[PDB]
Amino acid sequence: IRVFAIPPSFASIFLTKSTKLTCLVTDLTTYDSVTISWTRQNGEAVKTHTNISESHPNATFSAVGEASICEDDWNSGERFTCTVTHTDLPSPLKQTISRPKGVALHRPDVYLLPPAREQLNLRESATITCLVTGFSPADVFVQWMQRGQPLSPEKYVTSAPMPEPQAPGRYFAHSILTVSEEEWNTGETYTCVVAHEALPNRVTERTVDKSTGKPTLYNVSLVMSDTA
Amino acid sequence: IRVFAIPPSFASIFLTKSTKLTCLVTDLTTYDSVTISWTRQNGEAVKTHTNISESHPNATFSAVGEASICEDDWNSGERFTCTVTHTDLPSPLKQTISRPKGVALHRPDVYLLPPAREQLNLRESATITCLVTGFSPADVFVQWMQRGQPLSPEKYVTSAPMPEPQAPGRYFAHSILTVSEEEWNTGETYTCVVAHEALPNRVTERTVDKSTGKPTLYNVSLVMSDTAGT
Amino acid sequence: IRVFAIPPSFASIFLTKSTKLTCLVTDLTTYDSVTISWTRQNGEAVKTHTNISESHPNATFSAVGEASICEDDWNSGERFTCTVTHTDLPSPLKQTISRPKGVALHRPDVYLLPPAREQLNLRESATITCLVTGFSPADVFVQWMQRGQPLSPEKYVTSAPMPEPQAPGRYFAHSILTVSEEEWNTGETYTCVVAHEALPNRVTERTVDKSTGKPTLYNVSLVMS
Amino acid sequence: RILPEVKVEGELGGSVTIKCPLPEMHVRIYLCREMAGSGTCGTVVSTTNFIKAEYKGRVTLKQYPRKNLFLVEVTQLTESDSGVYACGAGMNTDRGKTQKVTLNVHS
Amino acid sequence: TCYTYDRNKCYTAVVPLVYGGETKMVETALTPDACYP
Ligand SMILES: *[C@@H]1O[C@H](CO)[C@@H](O)[C@H](O)[C@H]1NC(C)=O
Numbered sequence A: 001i002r003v004f005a006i007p008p009s010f011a012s013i014f015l016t017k018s019t020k021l022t023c024l025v026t027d028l029t030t031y032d033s034v035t036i037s038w039t040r041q042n043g044e045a046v047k048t049h050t051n052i053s054e055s056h057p058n059a060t061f062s063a064v065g066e067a068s069i070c071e072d073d074w075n076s077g078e079r080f081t082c083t084v085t086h087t088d089l090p091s092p093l094k095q096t097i098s099r100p101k102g103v104a105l106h107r108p109d110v111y112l113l114p115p116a117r118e119q120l121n122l123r124e125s126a127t128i129t130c131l132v133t134g135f136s137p138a139d140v141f142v143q144w145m146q147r148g149q150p151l152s153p154e155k156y157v158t159s160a161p162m163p164e165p166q167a168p169g170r171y172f173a174h175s176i177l178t179v180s181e182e183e184w185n186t187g188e189t190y191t192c193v194v195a196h197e198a199l200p201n202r203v204t205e206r207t208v209d210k211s212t213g214k215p216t217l218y219n220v221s222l223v224m225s226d227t228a
Numbered sequence B: 001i002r003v004f005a006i007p008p009s010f011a012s013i014f015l016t017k018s019t020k021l022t023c024l025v026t027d028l029t030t031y032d033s034v035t036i037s038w039t040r041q042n043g044e045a046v047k048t049h050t051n052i053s054e055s056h057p058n059a060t061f062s063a064v065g066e067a068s069i070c071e072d073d074w075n076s077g078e079r080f081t082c083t084v085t086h087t088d089l090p091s092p093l094k095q096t097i098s099r100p101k102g103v104a105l106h107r108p109d110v111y112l113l114p115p116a117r118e119q120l121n122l123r124e125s126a127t128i129t130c131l132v133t134g135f136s137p138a139d140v141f142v143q144w145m146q147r148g149q150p151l152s153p154e155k156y157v158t159s160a161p162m163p164e165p166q167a168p169g170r171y172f173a174h175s176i177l178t179v180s181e182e183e184w185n186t187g188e189t190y191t192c193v194v195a196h197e198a199l200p201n202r203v204t205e206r207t208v209d210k211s212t213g214k215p216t217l218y219n220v221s222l223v224m225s226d227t228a229g230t
Numbered sequence C: 001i002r003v004f005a006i007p008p009s010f011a012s013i014f015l016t017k018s019t020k021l022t023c024l025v026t027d028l029t030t031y032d033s034v035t036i037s038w039t040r041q042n043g044e045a046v047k048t049h050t051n052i053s054e055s056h057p058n059a060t061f062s063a064v065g066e067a068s069i070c071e072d073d074w075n076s077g078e079r080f081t082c083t084v085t086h087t088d089l090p091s092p093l094k095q096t097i098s099r100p101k102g103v104a105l106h107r108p109d110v111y112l113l114p115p116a117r118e119q120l121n122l123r124e125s126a127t128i129t130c131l132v133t134g135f136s137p138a139d140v141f142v143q144w145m146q147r148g149q150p151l152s153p154e155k156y157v158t159s160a161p162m163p164e165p166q167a168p169g170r171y172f173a174h175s176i177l178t179v180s181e182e183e184w185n186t187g188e189t190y191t192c193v194v195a196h197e198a199l200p201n202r203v204t205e206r207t208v209d210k211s212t213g214k215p216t217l218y219n220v221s222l223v224m225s
Numbered sequence D: 001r002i003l004p005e006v007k008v009e010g011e012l013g014g015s016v017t018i019k020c021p022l023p024e025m026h027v028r029i030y031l032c033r034e035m036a037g038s039g040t041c042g043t044v045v046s047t048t049n050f051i052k053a054e055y056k057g058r059v060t061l062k063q064y065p066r067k068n069l070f071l072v073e074v075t076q077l078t079e080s081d082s083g084v085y086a087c088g089a090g091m092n093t094d095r096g097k098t099q100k101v102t103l104n105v106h107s
Numbered sequence E: 001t002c003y004t005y006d007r008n009k010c011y012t013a014v015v016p017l018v019y020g021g022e023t024k025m026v027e028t029a030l031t032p033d034a035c036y037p
């Protein structure tokens, strides 16, 4: 019989560029005549609310609302409230959601490991790993771009942040892209681009090419002789 | 109140010869007379546990219920149930553990990636990544060895088995090991050893050192003698 | 009597990140009682400019008003009018300025060119040069980071965008970074980050290091005998 | 090192299956199309679920331990399938090929 | 002493794994695919 709040994650702030925070309704009867609003600190009105959900088997209703706000109004620190007044809840309840406290912000360090040499023998598919270590807080965003055009989201897989053992509560998380083995022996570049909320310009990018693991020099020495 | 249902990892069944199963309780109040029991799918009771643990500093209690079963029973896919009964909850809570049969067994492929070039420039730390791909099902055992002796889990961190993009049901996992920068330049060969069911020997390993992972020097001194000979 | 409208520059939108547009009022007779402001397409009100300038030394009554606006406003192209009030002015003067749409956006192509061998032989300084090229329109931003930390603006020099010689309507720029001989011989990737509104992520960067070339240097040393 | 180059004809509708030897010890058995320009070998069919991007969904693997023939079949022929298809084993692909043969379009 | 590995031969080793307190030193494989258990 509650109402929860879902803010747009930094991976959606960086992607949508149209920040939109929602409030979801859990375990309320599937009835009409519901109150929906988004009031900030001074309590002034916001953009209209649309996209009302449908009926559910467990007799619940989720009156959600999508609104357009500035990305920097959240930076200003607007305590946001979603007020809900339903028939089964005669006493209105207040919600709470905002941009939270200032964490110790550290910087992401993206290293980009190419596929192993012994993996490049069975000629099936190479795997390039973009390792983003030592950031804080969580909610890092990673995507790939070969040449200049963001790969389709079902070729690469990104893991979740996990605490680093030799460090304080700074995470580490890295994801990989499974390229074809006949494409990583062409030249074909693969840049990896990462966005974190503690970076100078909020985006870092790295790039590994085929001509990056080659040895700097050879030092062969033939000593052909005839003794034993 | 929370009760867990932890299936026995393969690292237990193959190594400890103790293919038991445990269910742990947490997030409850500090009380006693907790009736935590393991049963089979037929309603019959099995052997009980011992050495009830102690509460947590978070002012929450923790207890574990254990039952010892044989390996062939596990490989058949039987539905065991752990039931918890307490005064806090009027209805005992049940948790089910079984083995869903019908999943293929693939052999993991182990790739040992050394730290990147730009990582060995800050002169602060080096990360070696052991990547196991293609293995199915999940719950694989991985650890690291330094000059033939194992290390504590306080220096290496493994990742949960995640699905694979182009694979129907195959998975992949990462295990990173962080070491001091000067501990990797002088030699000090590291090995990653893994143990998943499907392996023909059930255990395999890979190894890297400073002279093997993406080297910048092919120091060769090959000598050939007695070309004519007899 | 004149009111220039200084628009928010993309070299300040990316640097300051606090988008503001300036209403530079110029060449009024020296008087008092000035209340200058801004309006949006909705006659939008704006927060008053802080530290507003007084009557000018040149006797030009120059009033500078800078108003904070949301960024979306400027990118949308929503127009803004700067109300200008002077004792001399019977009606508030208006400065209508909007970002102008209608220019093709072509992605920049940063290529970093490494220090020339000759400079290196003299052993005094090196110039590594980004060459952001192909960009369209103008107002590109270029800066340099080393070990992820941006360098001071007094170390590198960025040229203005000149039109491309042979290609159609398009621009190109330059950015020289001067480094010590020993600093470039020990590492120090010197990433060159270019920010421009036509980029897919508005940010690109390239890396050039002491080892960004020099292919396999063999050393076959046969001693056949 | 067997070289049984056969002249099995192919077409769009047409299906050609190659025959290969198997060690039967459940190693990595693969069929690989050698590239003349590349000078290396690119696996078209492998023991794992990998299939070449051009050959996605139009190829089938068929293993008989009973008769000691390892055979692969191609559902449709686009007439571009003319090259050295070599079979083999081991993790390696290039340097592990057992037998090679070049198939053909039309006839 | 040799340089390479015989494709029809099997080379293995003892790997000292633990999983807690016990240490089942188990035979590993340095050449997966040249030999099977
Ligand atoms: C290259 O080889 C020679 C002898 O063949 C040896 O003296 C020299 O030290 C080697 N170079 C390096 C960098 O090890």
Ligand SMILES: *[C@@H]1O[C@H](CO)[C@@H](O)[C@H](O)[C@H]1NC(C)=O
Binding pocket: B219, B220, B221
């Ligand atoms: C290269 O090999 C030679 C021959 O033994 C050896 O003397 C030398 O120390 C090696 N170089 C390095 C850098 O290890």
